[PDB]
Design a protein around this ligand. Structure first.
Ligand code: NA
Lengths: 66, 66
């Protein structure tokens, strides 16, 4: 999975805070996975990098939270 | 609006990318507005700050694209 696996690890990790904000991050990260799978089929590497960056920003918001 | 108008500023710039990844940022930006308005009515202010931070990461992710 690579991108998906780190996002799902963030989905799990965030799922244990059970708040409103976090249920907004979970929905978003789920959408990043779905968008990532399509952009990989499309071969759009600039946007794949863009989403990888978004994944590393969400990790630094949900690392400080927990 | 404080949070909302800047989120709308990020929505505006994301729409001028006309990319698949930007429609995920816009969708997510609308969800942040709705979630922000919600807990703002509760006075749950620790989470409003967290959403403010997520908006400022979104602001620094969309800045490379243009
Ligand atoms: Na979203």
């Amino acid at each position: 999975g690579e991108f998906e696996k780190r996002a799902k690890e963030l989905i799990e990790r965030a799922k244990k805070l059970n708040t409103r904000s976090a249920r907004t991050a979970i929905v978003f990260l789920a959408n990043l996975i779905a968008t990532y799978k399509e952009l990989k089929k499309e071969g759009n590497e600039k946007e794949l990098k863009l989403l990888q960056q978004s994944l590393a920003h969400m990790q630094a918001l949900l690392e400080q939270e927990e």
